[PDB]
Design a binder for this molecule. Structure first.
Ligand SMILES: CCCC(=O)SCCNC(=O)CCNC(=O)[C@H](O)C(C)(C)COP(=O)(O)OP(=O)(O)OC[C@H]1O[C@@H](n2cnc3c(N)ncnc32)[C@H](O)[C@@H]1OP(=O)(O)O
Ligand SMILES: CCCC(=O)SCCNC(=O)CCNC(=O)[C@H](O)C(C)(C)COP(=O)(O)OP(=O)(O)OC[C@H]1O[C@@H](n2cnc3c(N)ncnc32)[C@H](O)[C@@H]1OP(=O)(O)O
Lengths: 118, 865, 153, 157
């Protein structure tokens, strides 16, 4: 199994009410032996990052179904590097709102992975 | 028991009391499940008052089988203590009875419990009641909380052997963290401070009102617990009305049968006046109103018989539209029942349009005039939307504007450089941040003009936006006075103008808080707080005779889009509507003052129940408003807007959508709706084109003008299917009323997430059948196309404009900014009228500033799971 | 027109027959009895036609048929349950208490599949075939044969 | 078996116009609905471009979808006698029936159908009612959406 105790911060992006999917991901994470600090929905980058930094997690899972995801993750990647959290891995799963050209872009920016519906 | 909830509120008290001077570290512990190995550290999600540099929180899993704390707690604490914090708050997981591991690692201990602890003897088993420096009986709004306080306070007195003290003096507090600015929590806080203070802690003299006492006064409850079962009471009210209909009908039937048989004896010779004796008994048995109904029936028939509706000033109205064939189509077709039992039954259950219970409509006849062209505009900044408004409303006398705000404004925030906000500004709605932006939005338009009404859909920040709109309408007349006279109005002249504006201003805020949490999940303020301010607005309207503006539009559209079936949508929406009624009543307001200003909003789908939705909504309202609340005719008339279902509009084969939108528009018009919106066929893919919006508008024009059956205004009435479906749907709604009532009313059900739960259920049941092929959708899961399976909206300059106009506004009111914001908070603490302050606040504060101020005082929506 | 004039006449006869026997039962519940009412009602029994009398006779039995979830030999579904849980009856019968209205309705607009077949010539709509029949025809026999298969795909 | 009149209803092509052909599906829907409501034995639905050409491949699907949507998706159609009971339906049924009977009489006093055809009574009455329709359509008395009202500013042809 896992070597260390893996901590996560999960949340839905800003103004994104749809947390139906992110509440499923935090259950699978939990069942696989992860300590999940769930933040719920409507979370700004400044919030999520502050949570991740204080909790000192290994990973961040953000769902975005309202669009504006590119600028959002870029902000988070930037803000994480600035305040000593570049080794924290950011993950994306906004269903299919993110097209391949945007997945490739964000992953190149600093985002760990963005999972395509494929 | 509300561990995290109470903790968050306590931190907020620290921040408010010491003006954010204290550096507080929060160490949370939750149990880790031994099977999974994982843990749900779900304490941070409840924390609203930790978003500040002086606050630090680290969530921990117990990482131990039979422990309520982490085995590494003392080191973690020591680290925080060394980090030069002012106070370290540690919380454990769910305690048993014998568990009390927090006691040695902390200086002060606070046991938190609920009024449900079992028999009083159970308190003699709880080890923590023997060590706790403070005990907080949270959720003090539950049943048996008062007795729970007595029992616990006595037990702590007994444990401490302080029989020389009063039980009411024990450190046992009755708190209710769920409610904003709870005095109970403050009372607990006052105690904690004195204890911490004596135990070596520097604290400034408190700014919080030093409240004495031990229990929460249960202040700021919206719907009083005495009125908890209001929805059930309404269900009984309607059912009682129907049982009367059955009884009175039988009486009317027998009365007619007797006098009929009596006349047949006199024609045959031999007579028996014992028949008349029985008939005379029926005359008194029949009610006063029931008797007058049958009395006016022959006269009623003669009225609708002619070609004109003759009703010492007269008003004639056309009753007949002659067809192309020469056939006369009556607008309202009356039944041809010979049985007086049926006549009475029909007059009580489904009277003609414009008569109680207004089942077939609230008005006598449909308006012959052209439909009120709703001119909705909203995109970019205030300048662009104002242009859009003026371009559509060119040359028309009916200035009927409908405003849409961008997501930034919809959440009460100011536009900002921040990437998570900047992108949202201007996109999908107008960006309104300051009162200046609001004035630009409605420039040129005379808001006080009798032929100008302004609709605007805003929910969370509605009271603030309304305050801006009011100040705009007022300043428009202050400007018009300084222009007509050349001199500024005096103190007496201005106040005379200002008061006149408030009365005559027309418009509507499409605000519905109860829809926000139930279907949408879009709340920015706590439901209880919004309702308080909602009442504050309605109270303000009363005081200044604001009789031409509407502050509440009760929607169920978003609920339906979320997956709710027609019965759930109708029932929840009416329930919400009744909640608003109950809320305004508890504030001590008269029913005939706010009931006529209640708009409704439903979604029309393909389901059978949709055909009889409007009529059911009208009868349930009309009956209860007359019987339960005893309101006038103008209040018994439920007026609603129907918008065709977007849930039924698909991206697969979009040309089919007009077929569905037609059928939905038809039953809406058939059932005498008050307002109809028709969706474009490509709303499921792209932005409604100017061509696509014509096809949508043509559906209404074709039905209203070309369609023959629509020439008749009550075509639904009489149908065996309609009357049965009306009865079925009505009953189903009543039963739903009962289920919500036995959950503490609408608000109580929202605590359990009962609405959101049921909606999500019915949504999946739809999806299951849709995917299964069970529920057929043409073009989607059947009759699929063989040939194949298948912007910006805001200028960069516009975004920079809003940013510039904001910082310009902020600098222009830098002096009066903080002073006004503090005044606003104090009005919430002192439980004053919030909207009253907003009327002054919006002139020196921005939307974001006001919203975040109300966040600080505690009105912010707390997430849950 | 003659059929209609009979509907009016027979309806009044059915109405009076019910009114008399109704008033007659209400006297027996009060105490004093007048059998002269029954004498008038008995005259209505003969006045009502043979087919008209059988119509009202089968009406309560007719209501029980369309009341269930099946139309019971062979059986047929009567109810389609909605997405909300509401039961939609295929054929909805009137709820008239007046036997004058019942007879009037049974003669002028009986249920689908019964004389005068106003609401349809069949009892229930057929599951197999929709009323759908689309107009086709283009070019030679070979091309239309392909269009026929396309429509009935 | 003989008292049962079985009929086929086809939607009106007279009501389908070349001006704004996208509107025709709206009209063809409403006509299909009452046909299905009133328990017709057979239904043909016209394509939205009926006034221009013979139904194309895509346009015959939109026509066929009108029937499929009403029969499968439409809720009120789940009930097979929704017309019955309606005060409007029963009155209109009575009115139309009587009007037909009176027309029966006018033809009878012309020597029956054949005798009336000698005078060209049918062809005459038809041509009359046709012009009365055109006299009102052209005038604006009888509104036709997209044709004599709500005309498209952008669409010249
Ligand atoms: O347009 P509006 O909503 O501002 O009209 C306001 C007043 O008109 C009345 N009205 C609207 N539709 C009507 C109808 N179909 N028949 C009779 N009266 C009608 C309506 O009563 C209203 O008056 P009020 O403000 O309620 O007293
Ligand atoms: C500009 C040019 C325009 C033009 O000229 S377009 C003209 C093209 N013609 C058409 O579109 C329609 C043609 N006519 C027909 O299809 C038929 O005459 C008709 C009557 C409308 C339909 O016939 P069908 O659909 O085949 O069914 P049917 O009435 O003949 O009866 C068939 C037998 O099957 C049974 N059946 C069918 N449906 C039933 C039901 N719902 N309940 C109980 N039994 C049922 C039944 O046995 C029936 O026979 P029977 O009634 O016992 O004698």
């Amino acid at each position: 199994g896992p070597a260390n105790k893996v901590r996560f911060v999960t949340a839905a992006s800003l103004f994104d009410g749809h947390d139906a999917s992110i509440n499923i991901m935090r259950r699978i994470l939990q069942s696989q032996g992860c300590e999940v600090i769930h933040l719920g929905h409507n979370r700004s980058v400044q919030e999520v990052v502050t949570a991740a930094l204080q909790e000192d997690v290994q990973g961040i899972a953000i769902s975005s179904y309202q669009g504006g995801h590119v600028e959002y993750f870029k902000y988070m990647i930037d803000l994480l590097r600035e305040h000593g959290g570049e080794h924290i891995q950011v993950f994306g799963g906004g269903g299919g709102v993110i097209v391949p050209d945007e997945i490739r872009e964000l992953q190149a920016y600093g985002v760990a992975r963005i999972y395509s519906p494929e | 028991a509300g561990k995290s909830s109470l903790t968050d509120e306590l931190i907020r008290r620290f921040r408010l009391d010491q003006d954010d001077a204290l550096s507080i570290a929060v160490i949370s512990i939750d149990p880790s499940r031994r099977k999974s190995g994982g843990a749900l550290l779900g304490d941070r999600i409840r924390m609203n008052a930790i978003n500040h540099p002086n606050i630090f929180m680290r969530s921990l899993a117990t990482r131990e089988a039979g422990s309520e704390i982490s085995q590494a707690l003392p080191d973690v604490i020591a680290a925080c203590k060394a980090a030069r914090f002012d106070l370290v708050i540690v919380e454990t997981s769910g305690i048993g009875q014998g568990d009390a591991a927090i006691v040695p690692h902390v200086d002060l201990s606070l046991y938190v419990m609920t009024p449900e602890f079992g028999a009083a003897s159970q308190l003699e088993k709880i080890d923590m009641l023997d060590f706790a420096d403070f005990v907080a009986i949270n959720k003090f709004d539950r049943k048996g909380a008062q007795d729970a306080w007595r029992d616990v306070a006595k037990q702590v007195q007994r444990n401490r052997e302080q029989w020389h003290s009063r039980a009411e003096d024990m450190p046992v507090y009755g708190t209710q963290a769920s409610r904003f600015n709870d005095d109970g929590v403050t009372m607990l806080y006052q105690g904690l401070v004195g204890a911490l203070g004596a135990r070596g802690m520097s604290l400034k003299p408190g700014t919080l009102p030093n409240l004495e006492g031990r229990i929460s006064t249960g202040q700021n409850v919206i719907v009083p617990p005495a009125r908890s079962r209001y929805l059930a009471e309404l269900a009984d009210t309607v059912r009682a009305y129907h049982r009367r209909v059955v009884a009175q009908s039988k009486l009317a039937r027998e009365r007619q049968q007797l006098r009929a048989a009596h006349d047949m004896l006199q024609g045959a010779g031999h007579e028996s006046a014992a028949l008349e004796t029985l008939a005379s008994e029926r005359d008194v048995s029949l009610g006063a109103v029931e008797r007058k109904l049958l009395a006016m029936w022959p006269q009623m028939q003669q009225a609708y018989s002619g070609d004109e509706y003759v009703v010492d000033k007269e008003i004639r109205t056309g009753l007949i539209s002659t067809t192309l064939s020469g056939t006369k189509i009556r607008k309202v077709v009356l039944p041809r029942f010979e049985d007086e039992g049926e006549i009475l039954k029909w007059l009580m259950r489904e009277n003609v349009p414009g008569s109680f219970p207004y089942t077939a409509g609230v008005f006598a006849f449909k308006r012959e005039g052209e439909d009120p062209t709703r001119m909705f505009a909203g995109e970019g900044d205030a300048f662009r939307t104002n242009r859009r408004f003026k371009l559509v409303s060119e040359g028309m006398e009916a200035k009927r504007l409908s405003t849409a705000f961008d997501s930034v404004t919809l959440y009460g925030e100011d536009p900002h450089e921040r990437p998570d906000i900047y992108g949202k500004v201007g996109n999908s709605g107008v960006s309104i941040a300051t009162l200046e932006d609001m004035k630009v939005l409605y420039d040129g338009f005379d808001l006080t003009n009798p032929s100008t009404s302004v609709s605007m859909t805003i929910n969370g920040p509605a009271p603030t936006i309304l305050a801006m709109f009011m100040n705009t309408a007022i300043d428009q007349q202050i400007d018009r006075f300084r222009a007509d006279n050349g001199r500024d109005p005096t103190a007496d002249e201005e106040a005379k103008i200002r008061a006149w504006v408030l009365q005559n201003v027309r418009g509507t805020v499409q605000a519905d808080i109860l829809k926000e949490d139930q279907g949408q999940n879009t709340c920015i303020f706590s439901t209880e707080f919004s309702l308080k301010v909602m009442g504050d607005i309605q109270e303000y309207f009363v005081h200044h005779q604001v009789r031409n503006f509407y502050s509440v539009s009760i929607s169920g559209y978003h609920i339906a889009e979320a997956g709710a079936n027609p019965i759930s949508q109708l029932a929840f929406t009416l329930a919400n509507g009744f909640t608003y009624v109950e809320a305004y009543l508890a504030r001590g307001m008269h029913i005939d003052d706010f009931a006529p200003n209640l708009s409704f909003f439903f979604s029309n789908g393909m389901d059978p129940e949709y055909s009889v939705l409007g009529r059911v909504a009208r009868r349930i309202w009309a009956v209860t408003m007359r019987d339960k609340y005893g309101a006038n005719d103008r209040s018994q008339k439920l007026k609603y807007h129907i918008q065709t279902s977007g849930r039924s509009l698909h991206a697969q084969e979009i040309d089919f959508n007009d077929i569905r939108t037609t059928l939905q528009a038809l039953i809406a018009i058939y059932d005498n709706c008050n307002s109809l919106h028709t969706n474009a066929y490509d709303e499921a893919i792209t932005t409604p084109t100017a061509e696509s919006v014509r096809r949508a508008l043509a559906i209404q024009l074709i039905i209203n003008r070309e369609w023959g059956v629509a020439k008749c205004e009550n075509p639904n009435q009489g149908s065996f299917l309609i009357e049965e479906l009306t009865d079925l749907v009505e009953e189903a709604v009543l039963q739903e009323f009962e289920r919500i009532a036995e959950r503490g009313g609408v608000l109580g059900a929202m605590e359990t997430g009962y609405q959101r739960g049921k909606i999500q259920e019915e949504s999946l049941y739809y999806e299951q059948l849709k995917h299964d092929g069970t529920l057929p959708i043409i073009g989607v899961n059947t009759f699929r196309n063989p040939n194949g399976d298948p912007l910006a909206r805001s200028s960069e300059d516009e975004k920079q404009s809003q940013l510039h106009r904001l910082t310009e506004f902020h600098g222009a009111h830098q002096a009066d900014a903080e002073a006004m914001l503090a005044r606003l908070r104090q009005a919430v603490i002192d439980n004053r009228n919030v909207f009253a302050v907003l009327m002054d606040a919006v002139r020196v504060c921005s939307l974001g500033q006001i919203t975040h101020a109300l966040f600080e005082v505690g009105g912010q929506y707390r997430r849950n799971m």
